[PDB]
Amino acid sequence: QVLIDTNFINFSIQKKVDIVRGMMDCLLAKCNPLITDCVMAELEKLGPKYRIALKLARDPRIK
């Protein structure tokens, strides 16, 4: 179970690393990524410039 931080999503997009697949590659195991309201709220406050980051964070596989 992995807690995602706001900057983690931004850097993942910069490097073209999928969150779910990238974690499975790193740990060679099923990872259950988790986003808290604070991280979701921080993404929304970043503004229109980070709309792409907000849409990936809302992927259904991310609980």
Residues that bind other proteins (CB under 8 A): 1, 41, 44-45, 47-48, 51, 54, 58
Please give the DSSP secondary-structure letter assigned to residue 50: G
Between 54 and 62, CB nearer to other proteins: 54
- What's the rounded Cα separation, in Å, for the pair 27 and 47? 32
Interface map 8-37 toward Zn ion (x if CB under 5 A): ----------------------------x-
Interface map 34-63 toward Zn ion (x if CB under 5 A): --x-x-------------------------
- SS3 of 3, please? strand
Q: Which two tokens stand for residue 39?
A: 């991280």
- What's the rounded Cα separation, in Å, for the pair 63 and 57? 9
